[PDB]
Scaffold this motif. Structure first.
Motif, mmCIF file in Angstrom:
data_model
loop_
_atom_site.group_PDB
_atom_site.id
_atom_site.type_symbol
_atom_site.label_atom_id
_atom_site.label_comp_id
_atom_site.label_asym_id
_atom_site.label_seq_id
_atom_site.Cartn_x
_atom_site.Cartn_y
_atom_site.Cartn_z
ATOM 1 N N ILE A 66 0.798 -1.117 0.042
ATOM 2 C CA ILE A 66 -0.117 0.027 -0.020
ATOM 3 C C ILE A 66 0.827 1.126 0.013
ATOM 4 C CG2 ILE A 66 -1.337 1.620 1.561
ATOM 5 C CD1 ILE A 66 -2.343 -1.288 -0.194
ATOM 6 N N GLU A 67 1.910 0.980 0.689
ATOM 7 C CA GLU A 67 2.755 2.353 1.174
ATOM 8 C C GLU A 67 3.629 2.742 -0.217
ATOM 9 O OE1 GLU A 67 4.867 1.223 4.718
ATOM 10 O OE2 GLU A 67 2.894 1.200 5.630
ATOM 11 N N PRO A 71 -2.056 6.413 -4.070
ATOM 12 C CA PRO A 71 -1.682 7.847 -4.015
ATOM 13 C C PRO A 71 -1.197 8.308 -2.678
ATOM 14 C CG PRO A 71 -3.719 7.302 -5.261
ATOM 15 C CD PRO A 71 -3.160 6.050 -4.742
ATOM 16 N N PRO A 72 -0.142 9.151 -2.277
ATOM 17 C CA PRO A 72 0.064 9.628 -1.026
ATOM 18 C C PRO A 72 -1.083 9.902 -0.160
ATOM 19 C CG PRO A 72 1.606 10.433 -2.628
ATOM 20 C CD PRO A 72 0.832 9.752 -3.297
ATOM 21 N N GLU A 73 -1.818 10.711 -0.548
ATOM 22 C CA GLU A 73 -3.174 11.243 0.047
ATOM 23 C C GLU A 73 -4.200 10.225 0.693
ATOM 24 O OE1 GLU A 73 -4.248 14.880 -1.892
ATOM 25 O OE2 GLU A 73 -3.463 15.826 0.017
ATOM 26 N N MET A 74 -4.321 8.860 0.126
ATOM 27 C CA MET A 74 -5.079 7.883 0.541
ATOM 28 C C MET A 74 -4.347 6.842 1.378
ATOM 29 S SD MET A 74 -7.708 8.352 -1.016
ATOM 30 C CE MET A 74 -8.380 6.768 -0.447
ATOM 31 N N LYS A 75 -3.051 6.752 1.651
ATOM 32 C CA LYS A 75 -2.296 5.902 2.389
ATOM 33 C C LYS A 75 -2.687 5.679 3.808
ATOM 34 C CE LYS A 75 1.769 5.928 -0.656
ATOM 35 N NZ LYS A 75 3.044 6.450 -1.053
ATOM 36 N N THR A 76 -3.026 6.747 4.551
ATOM 37 C CA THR A 76 -3.575 6.725 5.826
ATOM 38 C C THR A 76 -4.656 6.060 6.317
ATOM 39 O OG1 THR A 76 -4.666 8.698 6.370
ATOM 40 C CG2 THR A 76 -2.078 8.794 6.417
ATOM 41 N N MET A 77 -5.706 6.316 5.175
ATOM 42 C CA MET A 77 -6.945 5.583 5.317
ATOM 43 C C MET A 77 -6.814 4.113 5.026
ATOM 44 S SD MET A 77 -10.137 7.015 5.876
ATOM 45 C CE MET A 77 -11.679 6.675 5.615
ATOM 46 N N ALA A 78 -5.966 3.754 3.950
ATOM 47 C CA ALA A 78 -5.759 2.439 3.515
ATOM 48 C C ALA A 78 -5.316 1.411 4.458
ATOM 49 C CB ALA A 78 -5.135 2.302 2.078
ATOM 50 N N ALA A 106 -11.424 -4.970 3.717
ATOM 51 C CA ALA A 106 -10.609 -3.679 3.494
ATOM 52 C C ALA A 106 -11.377 -2.641 2.298
ATOM 53 C CB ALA A 106 -9.147 -3.759 2.684
ATOM 54 N N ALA A 107 -11.922 -3.310 1.215
ATOM 55 C CA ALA A 107 -12.693 -2.824 0.242
ATOM 56 C C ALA A 107 -13.954 -2.143 0.678
ATOM 57 C CB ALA A 107 -13.261 -3.711 -0.767
ATOM 58 N N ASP A 108 -14.583 -2.804 1.895
ATOM 59 C CA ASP A 108 -15.717 -2.508 2.421
ATOM 60 C C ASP A 108 -15.385 -1.206 3.485
ATOM 61 O OD1 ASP A 108 -17.597 -4.033 1.198
ATOM 62 O OD2 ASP A 108 -17.420 -5.597 2.935
ATOM 63 N N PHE A 109 -14.506 -1.342 4.242
ATOM 64 C CA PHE A 109 -13.805 -0.193 5.052
ATOM 65 C C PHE A 109 -13.911 1.021 4.321
ATOM 66 C CE2 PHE A 109 -10.845 2.041 7.807
ATOM 67 C CZ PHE A 109 -11.375 1.641 9.099
ATOM 68 N N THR A 110 -12.827 0.956 3.314
ATOM 69 C CA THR A 110 -12.741 2.337 2.710
ATOM 70 C C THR A 110 -12.864 2.077 1.101
ATOM 71 O OG1 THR A 110 -11.079 3.989 2.010
ATOM 72 C CG2 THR A 110 -10.108 1.766 2.639
ATOM 73 N N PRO A 111 -13.778 2.315 0.469
ATOM 74 C CA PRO A 111 -14.381 1.988 -1.008
ATOM 75 C C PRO A 111 -13.494 2.952 -1.749
ATOM 76 C CG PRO A 111 -16.245 1.800 0.263
ATOM 77 C CD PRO A 111 -15.330 2.273 1.185
ATOM 78 N N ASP A 112 -13.291 2.852 -2.862
ATOM 79 C CA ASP A 112 -12.644 3.655 -3.953
ATOM 80 C C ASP A 112 -11.296 4.093 -3.392
ATOM 81 O OD1 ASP A 112 -14.559 3.687 -6.045
ATOM 82 O OD2 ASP A 112 -15.524 5.412 -5.278
ATOM 83 N N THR A 113 -10.410 3.037 -2.929
ATOM 84 C CA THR A 113 -9.218 3.345 -2.384
ATOM 85 C C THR A 113 -8.231 2.336 -3.035
ATOM 86 O OG1 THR A 113 -10.081 4.525 -0.460
ATOM 87 C CG2 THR A 113 -7.850 3.320 -0.148
ATOM 88 N N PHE A 114 -8.736 1.171 -2.799
ATOM 89 C CA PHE A 114 -7.909 -0.091 -3.162
ATOM 90 C C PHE A 114 -7.910 -0.281 -4.527
ATOM 91 C CE2 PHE A 114 -8.296 -0.548 1.280
ATOM 92 C CZ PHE A 114 -6.988 -0.563 1.708
ATOM 93 N N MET A 115 -6.795 -0.881 -5.199
ATOM 94 C CA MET A 115 -6.776 -1.286 -6.385
ATOM 95 C C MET A 115 -6.593 -2.804 -6.561
ATOM 96 S SD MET A 115 -4.395 -0.674 -4.397
ATOM 97 C CE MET A 115 -3.888 -2.194 -3.926
ATOM 98 N N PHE A 116 -7.660 -3.509 -6.686
ATOM 99 C CA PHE A 116 -7.809 -4.917 -6.845
ATOM 100 C C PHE A 116 -7.746 -5.454 -8.167
ATOM 101 C CE2 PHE A 116 -8.404 -9.498 -6.386
ATOM 102 C CZ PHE A 116 -8.033 -9.802 -5.420
ATOM 103 N N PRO A 117 -6.308 -5.871 -8.755
ATOM 104 C CA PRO A 117 -6.161 -6.840 -10.150
ATOM 105 C C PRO A 117 -7.070 -7.342 -10.719
ATOM 106 C CG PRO A 117 -4.105 -6.849 -8.771
ATOM 107 C CD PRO A 117 -5.375 -6.229 -7.747
#
Length: 117
Positions: A66-67, A71-78, A106-117
């Motif tokens: 994740i790190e 995007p830098p501004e999404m990292k703390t939430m992810a 994780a996807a449910d915790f913070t939508p539109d954040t993770f990239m799942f292949p």
């Protein structure tokens, strides 16, 4: 995308189709998927190296990924999401379940954040 190179490596191996996969890519993880879709998510985890040979998910490795990747501004939430979801795998014996429900958590915790292949 090593994202598309990961999907392209795993998808042909599983009885999954484009609609399912589009859903995951958009952080939409059904609560009751086909076993084949769960095992596709495991294949992804293995290729990313987050799944241990014993069939468990590495939180420390996922966190490191994740790190570098988000995007830098999404990292703390992810990071909050991964921390929260860390225990999820411990309620499933089957390693496809572990990988799939870990990502769903994780996807449910913070939508539109993770990239799942």
């Amino acid at each position: 995308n090593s994202m598309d190179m990961m999907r392209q490596a795993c998808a042909p191996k599983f009885k999954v189709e484009e609609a399912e996969l589009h859903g995951l890519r958009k952080s939409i993880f059904p609560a009751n998927p086909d076993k084949e879709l769960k095992c596709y998510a495991m294949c992804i985890a293995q290729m990313a190296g987050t799944m241990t040979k014993k069939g468990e998910i590495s939180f420390s490795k996922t966190m490191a990924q994740i790190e570098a990747m988000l995007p830098p501004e999404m990292k703390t939430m992810a990071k909050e999401a991964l921390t929260h979801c860390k225990d999820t795998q411990t309620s499933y014996k089957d390693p496809c379940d572990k990988a799939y429900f870990s990502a769903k958590c994780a996807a449910d915790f913070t939508p539109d954040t993770f990239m799942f292949p």
